[PDB]
Amino acid sequence: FMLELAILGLLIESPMHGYELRKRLTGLLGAFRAFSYGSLYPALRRMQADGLIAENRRVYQLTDKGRRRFGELVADTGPHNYTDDGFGVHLAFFNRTPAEARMRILEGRRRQVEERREGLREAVARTRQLHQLGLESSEREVKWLNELIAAERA
Amino acid sequence: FMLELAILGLLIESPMHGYELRKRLTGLLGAGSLYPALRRMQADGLILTDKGRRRFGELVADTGPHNYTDDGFGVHLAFFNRTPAEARMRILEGRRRQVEERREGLREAVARADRYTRQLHQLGLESSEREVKWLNELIAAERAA
């Protein structure tokens, strides 16, 4: 899902060659690694088959069915959107995400990081110095999400 | 994979039941059922048994890529008490390699700049930075004897 969203959301901007998509895909996650070819290209073969993209490696363009399918996925606010990769991908396309969905996604993310923080507070109640590090990160991210939630309300 | 080090490493300390296995086990990250693993680990004669004590001694020595992931690392780091100085050092380095690469992706991510994605990555970055700095301190300490 997060793959298709990533792909569809990139292609909507403009048509792209395989090289560009892999580059951009990697940029959406922050991997310090090309996105793997044998993860990308089978998705494109599938996404071609379902009539979401077309090919002229090559250059790839979005279909009308493609443009619609994106419009679905950007609206989606399911648990798929709250994971680290899920969130970062969706957050990219907040530009094209309705205010309602944005708000839901932010909250679903906040639930996820909140729970992480809780487990880590609980963990520190015990020589894992890494938990402490884990904790401060969560703290920062929650604080950030709250600021981002606050902004959406206003 | 290699949920077994976790169990064996806990178990030898004071062979309890679910109370304290799942509890302590859960305290690797926070907020499942180990039970099929225990049924298996019973069958192979690891549960701790003498064969168990040996099997742990293998696993604590291990320094493979399985040890460098977030869960992998934190589990192993628990049993550093019983991890040979050599293995400890290798594991710390293998972890540092992983976090280094994470940091690089994230530095690179921030560079392209979409205010919101940037800040998230920025957060990601500072965390990596803190963890690397920590690993260095922990590596430094292990050398000094």
Final residue of a structural domain among B83, B117, B133: B83
Nearest to A129 among B31, B104, B134 (CB): B134
Query: What SS3 state is found at A134?
Result: helix
Task: Provide the shortest C-alpha distance from residue A126 to chain B (in Å).
Answer: 10
Contact at 8 Å (CB) between B5 and B60? yes
> Degrees (nearest 5) of the Cα angle B4, B6, B12?
90
Which one, of A107, A111, A88, lies nearest residue A28 by Cα?
A: A88
Whether residues A103 and A71 share a domain: the answer is no
> Are both A60 and A9 inside the same structural domain?
yes
Backbone phi, psi, residue B64, to 5°:
-70, 170
- Measured between alpha carbons, how far is A141 from A88 in angstroms, rounded to an integer? 13
d(CA A20, CA A6): 13
CB-based contact A51:A8 (threshold 8 Å): no
On whether any CB of chain B is under 8 Å from the CB of A124, the answer is no
Nearest CB among B77, B109, B134 relative to A30 is that of B109
Q: Please state, as a whole number, how many other Cβ atoms lie within 10 Å of the Cβ of residue B75.
A: 21
CB contact under 8 A, B105 and A30: yes
Q: How many CB atoms lie within 10 A of CB B113?
A: 11
What size, in residues, is chain A? 154
**Residue B69 Cα to chain centre, angstroms:** 7
- Do B9 and B76 sit in the same domain of this protein? yes
Q: Same domain for A40 and A18?
A: yes
Same domain, B77 and B16: yes
Note whether B32 and B53 are same-domain residues.
yes
Query: What CATH number is given to the structural domain containing A79?
Result: 1.10.10.10
The DSSP code for A80 is G
Q: Which residues pair with A54 in a beta bridge?
A: A61
Residue type, position A45, single letter: R
Q: What is the DSSP letter of A36?
A: P
Neighbours of A148 (CB within 10 A): 19
Going from the C-alpha of A70 to that of each of A9, A19, A48, A63, B108, the distances in angstroms are: 7, 21, 14, 10, 27
Q: Range of A17's domain?
A: 2-92
Hey, are the CB atoms on A128 and B77 less than 8 Å from each other?
Answer: yes
The answer to whether B131 contacts A133, with C-beta atoms less than 8 Å apart, is yes
Q: Does B116 touch chain A (CB under 8 A)?
A: yes
CA distance B19 to A54: 56
Domain endpoint, select from B66, B83, B100: B83
Strands (E), A83-137: none
> A121 and A86 in one domain?
no
Distance CA A125, CA B27 (A): 9
Do residue A73 and residue A17 come from a single domain? yes
Q: In this structure, are B78 and B9 located in the same domain?
A: yes
A94 touching B (Cβ < 8 Å)? yes
Q: Which DSSP string do the residues of chain B spell out, in sequence order?
A: --TTHHHHHHHTTS---HHHHHHHHHTTT-----HHHHHHHHHTT----HHHHHHHHHHHH--SGGGTSHHHHHHHHHGGGGS-HHHHHHHHHHHHHHHHHHHHHHHHHHH---HHHHHHHHHHHHHHHHHHHHHHHHHHHHH--
The SS3 assignment for A53 reads strand
Q: Which residues of chain B are within 8 Å of residue A32 when distances are taken between CB atoms?
A: 101-106, 108
> Could you tell me if A32 lies within 8 Å of chain B, comparing CB atoms?
yes
Do A30 and B77 count as a contact with CB atoms less than 8 A apart?
Answer: no
A137 touches chain B (CB under 8 A): yes
3-state secondary structure of A17: strand
Same domain, A133 and A69: no
Q: Is A62 helix (H, G, I), strand (E, B) or coil?
A: strand
CA distances from A130 to A110, B101, B124, B130 (A): 22, 18, 15, 10
One domain, residues B39 and B61: yes
Question: For chain B, what is the domain count?
Answer: 2
Q: Name residue A61's beta-bridge partners.
A: A54
User: Could you give the angle at the alpha carbon of B109 between the alpha carbons of A145 and B96, nearest 5°?
Assistant: 95
Residues B75 and B139 in one domain: no
Which of A45, A72, A92 terminates a domain? The answer is A92
